[PDB]
Assembly symmetry: none
Homo-oligomer: 72 residues x 12
């Protein structure tokens, strides 16, 4: 799990949201009368009504993610 | 789990939200009469009604994340 | 878990929120009559009605996160 | 768990919130008639109605976080 | 758990909040008729109705956090 | 748990809060008829109705925090 | 315009209304840049969201109404 | 305009209203830049969200109404 | 305009209103830059959110109303 | 305008109102830059949020009302 | 304008109001830069948030009202 | 204007009001830069937050009211 980023040197961004009665649930877990469960999140969960990503990367960007599940 | 970032050197950002009766639940866990459960979050959970990410990276950016689950 | 950041050298940001009756729950855990549970958060949980991230990184930025779960 | 940051050298930020009856719960735990539970937070939990992060990093920034859970 | 920061050398920030009947709960724990529980916070919990972070890092910044849970 | 910071050398910040009937609870613990519980806080808990952090770091800043929980 | 009523002698009434955001306008008159207008009401105007009339007349009932408009 | 009523001799009434944000306007008149207008009410104007009339007349009832408009 | 009423001799009434943000306007008149207007009310104007009339007349009841408008 | 009433001889009334932020306007008149206007009320104006009339007439009741408007 | 009433001979009334921030205006008149206006009230204006009239008439009741407007 | 009343012979009344921040205006007149106005009240103006009239008339009751307006 190695991440690196380097940068060497030698407009209008409009988001308009007009909603009404917005109900958002990003990560939900409902367990009833069960025995064993695992909710494993290790990446990126984005939830919205107006989910906007403008000009996310304009330089050095590097996201390193890893998940592990071992059950011996 | 190594993260590195270096930078060597030698506009209008508008978000408009006009909502009404907004209910947001980012991370929720509901356990009733169960035995064993694991809610493991190790990444990035973003929840909103107007979730906007403008000009997130313009330089050296590097996010290193890792999760581990061992059950012997 | 090593994080590093170095920087060597040799506009209008508007967010407008006009809501009414906003109910927000970031991290919630509901346990009733259960036996064993683990709520493990080790990353980044962002919850809002108007969740805006403008110009987050413009220099040296590096977030290193790690989670571990061992059950022998 | 090592974090480092160094910087060597040789606008309008508006947030407008006009809400009414805002109820916020950042981190909540509800335990009724259970036996064992663990609420482990070791990262970053942000909760709001108008959660704005403007110009978070413009220099040397590095957040190192780690969590550990061992049950032998 | 080592944190370091060094800096060597050789605008308008407006937040406007106009709310009414705001109820905020940052960290809450409700235990009724249970046996064992642990609420462990070791990172950063931010809760608000208008949670604004403007120009957080402009120099040397490095936050090192770690949590440990051992149950033999 | 080592923290270091050094700095060697050789605007308008407005927050406006106009609320009414604001109830804030930062850290609360409710224990009824339980046996054992631990509320361990060792990081940073920020709670407010208008929680604003403007120009937090502009020099050498480094916060080192650590928590330990051992139950043999 | 003569009304008369005489009476000589020798259960469950349930109304259930569960609405949300109800806007009612019984008698409205909108005049803009006009010359002459007449709004003459002399009968019976009933306006509602749940307009219920149960067991209105069980005895002597007699409603006598009259309207007149003369323009010589 | 004569009204008379005589009476010679020789249960559960439930109304349930559960609303939210109810706006009621019984008699309204809007005049802008006009010359002449007449709003004449002489009968019975009933306006509501839950307008219930239960067992209005069980005896001698007689409503005599009259309106007149003369313009010579 | 003669009204008469004579009477010669020889349960549960429940109203339940549970509202929120109720705005009521019974009789309103808006005049702007006009010349002549007449608002004549001579009957019965009833305005409400929960307008209930239970068992209004059980005996001798007689309402005599009259309006007159002469413009020579 | 003659009213007469004679009477010769030889339960639970529950009203429940639970509101919040109730604004009531019975009789309102708005005049701006006009010349002539007349607001004539001579009947019965009832305005409320929970306007209840239970068992209004059980005996001799007679309301005689009259209005007059002469403009020669 | 004659009113007469004669009577010759030979329970639980509950009103429950639980409000919050109640603003009531019975009779209001707003005059700005006008010339002539008349607000004539001669009947019965009832304004409230919980306007209840229980068992108003059980005997001899007779209300005689009259209004007059002459403009020669 | 004659009123007469004669009577010849040969329970629990509960009102419960629990309000908060109640503003009441019975009769109001606002005059600004006008010329002529008349506010004539000759009937009955009732204004309240909990306006209750229980058992108003159980005997001889007769209210005689009259208003006059002459402008030659």
């Amino acid at each position: 799990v190695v991440a690196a980023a380097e940068k060497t040197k030698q407009g209008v961004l409009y988001v308009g949201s007009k909603t009404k009665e917005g109900v958002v649930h990003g990560v939900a877990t409902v367990a009833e009368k069960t025995k064993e469960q695992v909710t494993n999140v290790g990446g990126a969960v984005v939830t919205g009504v107006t989910a906007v990503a403008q000009k996310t990367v304009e330089g050095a960007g590097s996201i390193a993610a890893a998940t592990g599940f071992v059950k011996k």
